[PDB]
Description:
This is part of a larger assembly, with chains A (68 residues), B (121 residues), C (233 residues), D (60 residues) and E (249 residues). By secondary structure, chain A is mostly helical. Chain A contains three helices and two strands. With 121 residues, chain B is α+β, with helices and mostly antiparallel strands. Chain B is built from four helices and four strands. Chain B has a four-stranded antiparallel β-sheet, sandwiched between helices. Chain B starts with 37 loop residues before the first helix and ends with a helix. By secondary structure, chain C is of the alpha+beta class. Chain C is built from eleven helices and six strands. Chain C has helices at residues 31-45, 50-53, 63-71, 79-92, 113-121, 138-141, 143-150, 160-166, 185-200, 203-206, 217-230, and strands at 47-48, 110-111, 127-131, 154-157, 174-177, 211-212. The longest helix of chain C is centred in the C-terminal third of the chain and has 16 residues, at 185-200. Chain C is extended and about 95 Å long. The termini of chain C are far apart. Chain A binds chain C through residues 1-3, 5-6, 9-10, 16-21, 23-24, 27-28, 31-32, 39-40, 42-44, and chain C through 31, 35, 38-39, 42-43, 46-52, 113-114, 117-118, 135-139, 141-143, 146. Chain C binds two RNA strands through residues 4-21, 23, 25-33, 38, 41-42, 44-46, 215-225.
Amino acid sequence: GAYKYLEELQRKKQSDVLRFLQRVRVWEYRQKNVIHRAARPTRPDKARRLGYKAKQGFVIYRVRVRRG
Amino acid sequence: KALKVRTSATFRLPKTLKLARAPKYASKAVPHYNRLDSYKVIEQPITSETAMKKVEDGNILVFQVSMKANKYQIKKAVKELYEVDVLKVNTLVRPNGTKKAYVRLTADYDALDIANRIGYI
Amino acid sequence: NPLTHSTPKNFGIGQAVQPKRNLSRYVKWPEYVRVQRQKKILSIRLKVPPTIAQFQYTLDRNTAAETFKLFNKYRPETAAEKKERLTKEAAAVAEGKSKQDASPKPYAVKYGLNHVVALIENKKAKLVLIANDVDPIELVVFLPALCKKMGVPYAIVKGKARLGTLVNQKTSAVAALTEVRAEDEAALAKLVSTIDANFADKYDEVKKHWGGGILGNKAQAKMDKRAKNSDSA
Amino acid sequence: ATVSKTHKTVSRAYGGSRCANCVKERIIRAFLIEEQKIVKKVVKEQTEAAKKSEKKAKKK
Amino acid sequence: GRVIRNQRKGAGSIFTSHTRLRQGAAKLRTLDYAERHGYIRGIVKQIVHDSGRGAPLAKVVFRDPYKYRLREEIFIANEGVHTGQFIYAGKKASLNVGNVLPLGSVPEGTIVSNVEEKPGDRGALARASGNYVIIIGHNPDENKTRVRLPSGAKKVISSDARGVIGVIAGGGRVDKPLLKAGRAFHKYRLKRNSWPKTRGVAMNPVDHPHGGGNHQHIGKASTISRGAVSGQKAGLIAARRTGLLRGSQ
RNA sequence: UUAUAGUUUCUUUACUUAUUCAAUGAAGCGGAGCUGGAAUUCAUUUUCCACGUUCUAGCAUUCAAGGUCCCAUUCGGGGCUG
RNA sequence: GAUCCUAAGAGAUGGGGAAGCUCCGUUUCAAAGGCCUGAUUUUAUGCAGGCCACCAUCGAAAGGGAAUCCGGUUAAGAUUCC
Lengths: 68, 121, 233, 60, 249
């Protein structure tokens, strides 16, 4: 299962890989709306651990709250 | 590749197929009957001595019409019911909060003939 | 001819209101088009880590063509072909009572991510095709490194759509040939050697080297001007 | 809106848009400058032809 | 204590500009291809008044290079500009009064006006009556030209920043006394609601930091700090000095 | 002593791509090529050197000229230049 | 007269703020529908001549504004009834 390799990789957030991906995705998300939709989960292993399934009815929604 | 010429510096929403509504079930399925029919339009006549003076003299019929009734619908109602050609219809709403209409007929029909036909004198 | 006279147009500054020419470079594109482009450019401009950059080197279009020609066979059973095979099997469960010996062993392509990951971990895979355009790359960033460590021959092939069309899905993000017919083992062996030349062998070197850090064409031309300034004076 | 064109338009060039003095003054302006643009055309063409034909006296 | 006149001016309810009787936004026509590479000719179609502003506006009809129109633009008439005369806007345009050329494409010592701070601004500096910039210096190396502003301050603007040649018309407007209150009243009535100013000292101490006392007096220093909070500034903000000087300012 | 290029360790500059401020109804941006007229080292594979509108309160909008295939040569509509 | 238009302005929309009641802004960092000619006569539907676009709505019974006058008439209406 790729899900274990995803779960392990996603924890190392300052690994050269996730550093790059954080920088490019945070740009993609900031350019879209505040509360916009998501065609699929960005983290399909995190989603399904919280109870997401890949059947009709389940949705994902990306949302950005101001910090501070 | 070889992407199409665009003389416009603006992109606008491409036109797409506005599809017609085709419901699986009728909304009501039994349509309503005519709300204001002839008899709902023309409710009563007005038997006040002033209304009678105008019926005898002017060749006019003072009829108590509904609210939500067009001058067109009063003309059409009087013609269909009483069998008479209406020259004009002048409508005011009374201080009583009911409508009344001065149905003047063409020269062909004397209003007394149709007043006596209805019953009231 | 005798009554029609040739004229200048004269599209200078003043004369002749400019003609409706191509403004396809200057179109105020929708924000979704503007964003999918600006993301593609920005992903190249920033320094790409060497484990992400290894997906830029996709398999060339003749080795790919031959890989897909072998992978065209062992296509997973269709909905019709499945139904008919089940009708023969389930009928033979009554007529003869000979089940699980009828319907001869299937040679199909193995696909789905969590399936093939486990086939590589158990070292049953003989060729693994890894897509280069998976929506969250992280799903696949680990797969060449796992595939090498286990010592399965793997190739980064162009198109998850192309893989999807091969497995009767829309996208597959991964494919794997774990078995083969005796006839077609020779082709697999050759194509495995030619893809090992590109990906497997060079993994240890490509592991070191970064992608991206590439300027836009206007800043490229400016640097080439500012470099010819000092040295090429 | 329901009046004849006669009532609100004199039969001339611009008629019910400009005066008879304003229209004649822009006729004389239009034609004159069209003849000073055709004399410019040749004066500049002969200043080109002069500079071309006499430039090659020097390289010799 | 109350919120001071000064404090509640910025809320902008009644204190907003009286903007009905005005012609429009007085700008230079946008920095475009024709102005960059050549110049466009425009005709001063009419020279009009503008309320709350003591300098005539030159409505100058230009053409549209791309479609069949006459894009009319509202300028601030330089002095000596007249009706029907041709204004020339661009890099290659000649150095005559009314013409709009970038400061880089101009010699030193020129008297320019309606200058851009940034290139593509469409006018910012020397826009008021009888005022102008003097282009002091230049530098094509890091193309930025030195200019002297009506305040007497030296700035450094880009060489692509445009400006109209000559002084802005209506000069000497301030040198006549306004006269008897009503003249001021009528002047202000078409700009803003900043007129007959009450003295903070003549108010009660609620209303202003100057109020109160059995005599009208400020009581403490009128020179207030720059770091004084939005509500405390009444008198002279960050006063480098005070008093009437001797000889020259 | 420095000759590995294995981190900013601190300070002097630079790069765009994040961030930022504008403007346009996102038209002409950047590089190169023509024509330059020429640079003279000498007519060039060498590098400096512009790119259709100005006396005048007019006008400038529906692709015209050449060229090429179709319209069986009616009607014209189309390729590339311009 | 109202109905229509816009004025100082009030205000949805896109969006962005706010724990939220809702606040900002009204042309904005939006893919923001309408106009006409015949078509072709498939119990009337597919064309194209093609064009055109910084864009709700509310806001005046004194501002802008399509068009009525005379005579007579009733206990009480009339620039309306005759």
